[PDB]
Design a protein around this ligand. Sequence first.
Ligand SMILES: Nc1ncnc2c1ncn2[C@@H]1O[C@H](CSCC[C@H](N)C(=O)O)[C@@H](O)[C@H]1O
Length: 229
Amino acid sequence: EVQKNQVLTLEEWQDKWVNGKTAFHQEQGHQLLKKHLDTFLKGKSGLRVFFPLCGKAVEMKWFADRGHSVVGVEISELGIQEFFTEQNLSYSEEPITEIPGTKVFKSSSGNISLYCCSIFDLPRTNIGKFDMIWDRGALVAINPGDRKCYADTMFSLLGKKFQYLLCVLSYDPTKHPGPPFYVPHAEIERLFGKICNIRCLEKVDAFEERHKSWGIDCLFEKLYLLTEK
Ligand SMILES: Nc1ncnc2c1ncn2[C@@H]1O[C@H](CSCC[C@H](N)C(=O)O)[C@@H](O)[C@H]1O
């Protein structure tokens, strides 16, 4: 209930990128994913992997380097450009014909495509189906009221068998209004429990010096693996 009425705008997010206020970004990449990556990919070849609200997530290159095709969606053209610049990847552009005024950025390698539009635009595209989702700073970045629509959008993107990897943050929601927002276990169950087997693989201290600026003094991260019932 606490953060329920928080409504951020796309322009606010784009402004963060313009202003360099991108402290959510992890240059060395996600350490829980790094730990479990081989287990998740064991026996797997040429998967399609989706990154909602992808920013310039370095982990997209982890999957592409391992032979999987990666699609991300990110509202900030600046963040997308920073991804290609930082990963030293050439790219070219095409329109997203269904959503006038927007573009998809395609790595020359053919392995990474970043849609520069809203995640909520995707059901009107032919983005298709995915074997795997990496969701970090995404479900937690969405306006709280938008979570059900987001969850339904995720389901629309999933193949019959899937591994949905989900990172959420645990902190006292009365101390920081978000983002990132507080998504408790019960909320995961509400959104994903009917369709998914839910495993919480990790719960680790995530508190860094930068988190003092949110007015909290404890922060934990949980890594979930959601799969078909
Ligand atoms: N509706 C929306 N559609 C697409 N991108 C959105 C969005 N709302 C917010 N964003 C983008 O979502 C990102 C959340 S911050 C997390 C970024 C990235 N997943 C990482 O792990 O580092 C921002 O880059 C923001 O610009």
